Amino acid sequence: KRVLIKPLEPLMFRSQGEFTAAQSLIIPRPSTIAGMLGYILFNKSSGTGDWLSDLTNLLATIYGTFIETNGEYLFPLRMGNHLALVDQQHLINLPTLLEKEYERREKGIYELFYDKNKLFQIINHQDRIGISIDKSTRTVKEHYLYSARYLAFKKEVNYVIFIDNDAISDKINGKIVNFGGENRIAKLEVDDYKVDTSIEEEYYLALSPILIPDEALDNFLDNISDYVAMGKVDKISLGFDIANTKRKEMLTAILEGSIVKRSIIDFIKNEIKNDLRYRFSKYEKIGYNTLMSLCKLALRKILS
RNA sequence: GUUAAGUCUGGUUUCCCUCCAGGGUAUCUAAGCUUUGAAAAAAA
């Protein structure tokens, strides 16, 4: 039902190329969680060139990711190039604060992203530099000096997701998994948890990157205010497929932690023919289009 | 009255240091060197 991913050690979720150190994301993308879960549930017989088909077959609908620090729940929130983790008690008045007056707008939002921001109390950015040594000289092998900015945790942190199917939630319990990038470790634990679904509010929080079908890109973009009140829109890669050893895709997405307006739902519902409808239904199945209500902890997918 | 004979004794006691000063002043580190040379982007 509810799955807590507890990182045993600093993590690495590489983003935006490798070219001082390569930076890590705060919240891992849903493709990473889906890939770890499929890695657990894998069987070496269902192979197909469609990574997400073989991945949707291995599991069920996964709901987006947030932070459980110590009983508290933190949620991503971005204003544009400004990520933060806030407890939902500060998301309540947010829509009121959105089309509130100007100076009150900046007062409130910059009090949220700076003092109410619980990111740095939780997250440290730990640069790690490694090298490679040739086994006969015992001096650094030439050209092998790499760096990466890992995501260290000051206090114990969990990533929270919700999975619908309860059959896999038995062979997922207590598994030690290779969560993330350069061979780091996290533990999964499964617990029964109660979460509402599909509330009809006006302002939702993108818990996961809301994908855009690359057909309504111009449509969605040239009038952007109609769908997102605050957040970031960026072209993101969908990761790396283990089977064929390639990058996955690139799609414009509404980065997790954005504030979406109810209209976006109907918009996405009107711009998908059967083909890409099935495609993006799969995408949502593995966990991309997850919304939460600023009211309370109540999730819903956009299409499903 | 006369005689005759001298004998004993030959430095003792006390005090043997007391009081003040028991180190003072100056110097309390100085000038250098504060990283250098190899490895910056590698094959699948």
Side-chain angles (χ1 to χ4, degrees):
Chain A
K1 196 45 196 179
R2 192 187 66 162
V3 186
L4 287 183
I5 320 162
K6 326 187 278 306
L8 303 196
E9 62 189 356
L11 289 184
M12 185 62 190
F13 301 117
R14 200 174 319 264
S15 176
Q16 60 186 357
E18 191 175 359
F19 279 158
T20 76
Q23 177 71 79
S24 187
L25 299 163
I26 305 295
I27 308 286
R29 297 273 169 73
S31 62
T32 288
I33 305 178
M36 175 255 307
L37 289 173
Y39 197 100
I40 304 185
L41 311 158
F42 192 66
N43 286 87
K44 307 178 168 301
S45 63
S46 46
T48 304
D50 202 67
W51 59 269
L52 69 159
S53 89
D54 299 330
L55 194 58
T56 55
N57 282 133
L58 283 175
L59 50 82
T61 290
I62 287 155
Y63 291 95
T65 311
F66 54 90
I67 294 289
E68 187 270 343
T69 81
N70 201 358
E72 208 80 60
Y73 276 158
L74 288 191
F75 298 92
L77 186 78
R78 52 174 78 240
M79 182 191 166
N81 198 0
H82 279 260
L83 190 48
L85 302 174
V86 295
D87 41 359
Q88 62 278 59
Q89 308 96 37
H90 308 164
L91 303 170
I92 289 167
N93 62 315
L94 209 155
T96 300
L97 171 75
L98 282 175
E99 63 99 19
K100 203 152 147 59
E101 78 90 13
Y102 169 78
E103 300 93 15
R104 278 282 257 276
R105 268 203 284 115
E106 43 253 20
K107 186 187 307 201
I109 64 190
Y110 287 97
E111 183 67 24
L112 196 49
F113 281 89
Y114 275 62
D115 201 83
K116 295 182 180 66
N117 190 353
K118 285 194 170 176
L119 181 62
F120 298 98
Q121 330 183 1
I122 292 281
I123 287 314
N124 182 69
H125 288 320
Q126 181 198 79
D127 305 277
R128 296 203 182 193
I129 298 174
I131 60 182
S132 181
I133 304 166
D134 52 358
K135 314 300 176 294
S136 45
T137 297
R138 200 181 288 289
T139 294
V140 53
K141 184 184 301 274
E142 300 81 352
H143 305 286
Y144 285 74
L145 190 146
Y146 65 98
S147 63
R149 190 169 281 266
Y150 286 49
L151 188 89
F153 304 98
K154 298 183 176 190
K155 44 186 76 59
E156 53 86 11
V157 164
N158 310 310
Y159 287 104
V160 195
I161 55 159
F162 298 96
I163 173 64
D164 283 330
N165 162 279
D166 208 351
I168 76 173
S169 299
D170 161 72
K171 61 178 71 64
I172 286 301
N173 197 234
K175 293 303 174 193
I176 295 297
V177 302
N178 195 355
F179 192 43
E182 275 280 309
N183 206 22
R184 315 299 285 165
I185 291 290
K187 180 163 205 181
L188 300 185
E189 79 91 15
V190 190
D191 62 332
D192 295 21
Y193 189 94
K194 182 51 180 53
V195 49
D196 193 338
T197 46
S198 181
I199 318 304
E200 301 313 301
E201 269 281 358
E202 323 304 322
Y203 290 95
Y204 298 108
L205 178 65
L207 266 286
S208 285
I210 304 167
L211 308 188
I212 294 168
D214 196 9
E215 301 193 328
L217 256 185
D218 167 71
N219 295 337
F220 172 84
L221 261 60
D222 57 353
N223 48 330
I224 185 54
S225 298
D226 206 0
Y227 305 110
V228 283
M230 65 179 290
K232 203 178 176 201
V233 190
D234 210 329
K235 180 76 59 190
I236 73 168
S237 159
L238 291 199
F240 194 98
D241 51 5
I242 297 309
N244 301 115
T245 71
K246 311 182 315 300
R247 271 91 158 91
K248 290 189 165 176
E249 288 97 16
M250 288 189 73
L251 278 155
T252 296
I254 313 303
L255 309 181
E256 68 279 18
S258 290
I259 287 299
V260 290
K261 288 194 299 311
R262 182 174 172 169
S263 68
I264 193 56
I265 293 177
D266 60 66
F267 175 65
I268 300 299
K269 297 212 71 175
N270 306 141
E271 313 312 311
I272 42 187
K273 185 176 67 64
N274 180 29
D275 164 272
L276 72 160
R277 171 56 176 263
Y278 191 37
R279 180 75 184 192
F280 280 56
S281 67
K282 284 187 168 176
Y283 278 154
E284 296 206 1
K285 177 131 183 170
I286 76 182
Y288 285 98
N289 300 173
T290 306
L291 308 178
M292 200 191 52
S293 168
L294 310 188
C295 167
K296 68 145 182 178
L297 200 144
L299 313 168
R300 56 162 295 179
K301 302 288 193 166
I302 291 189
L303 304 187
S304 190

